[PDB]
């Protein structure tokens, strides 16, 4: 939240998402790179 003279964290959602097998094989082990996106199943929902 941005007040007139200050900024305040209303909330900070922190999560750990697994790196899918295909990204481990094709990006991390192949090139030493990761995707900047996290697509994973959390709370029975596919979240990106």
């Amino acid at each position: 939240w941005f007040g007139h003279r200050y900024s305040q964290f209303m909330g900070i959602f922190e999560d750990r998402a697994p790196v899918p097998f295909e990204e481990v094989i094709d990006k991390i082990n192949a090139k030493g790179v990761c995707r900047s996106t996290a697509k994973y199943v959390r709370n029975n929902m596919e979240t990106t």
Partner: protein, 49 residues
């Protein structure tokens, strides 16, 4: 035949010499160093209702 003459007998060994003394026996320290501290913080909670 003749009788065997006396054998040379064993002796009491000299014994052990002991030095009297005072000892302090130290062991490896496994106790962590302990000290006093003071924490200053603020519980900040934001409730969305």
């Amino acid at each position: 035949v003749q009788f065997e003459q006396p054998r040379r007998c064993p002796t009491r060994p000299e014994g052990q010499n002991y030095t009297e003394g005072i000892a302090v026996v130290f062991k490896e320290n496994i106790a962590p160093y302990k000290f006093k501290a003071t924490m200053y913080y603020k519980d900040v909670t934001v409730s969305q209702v």
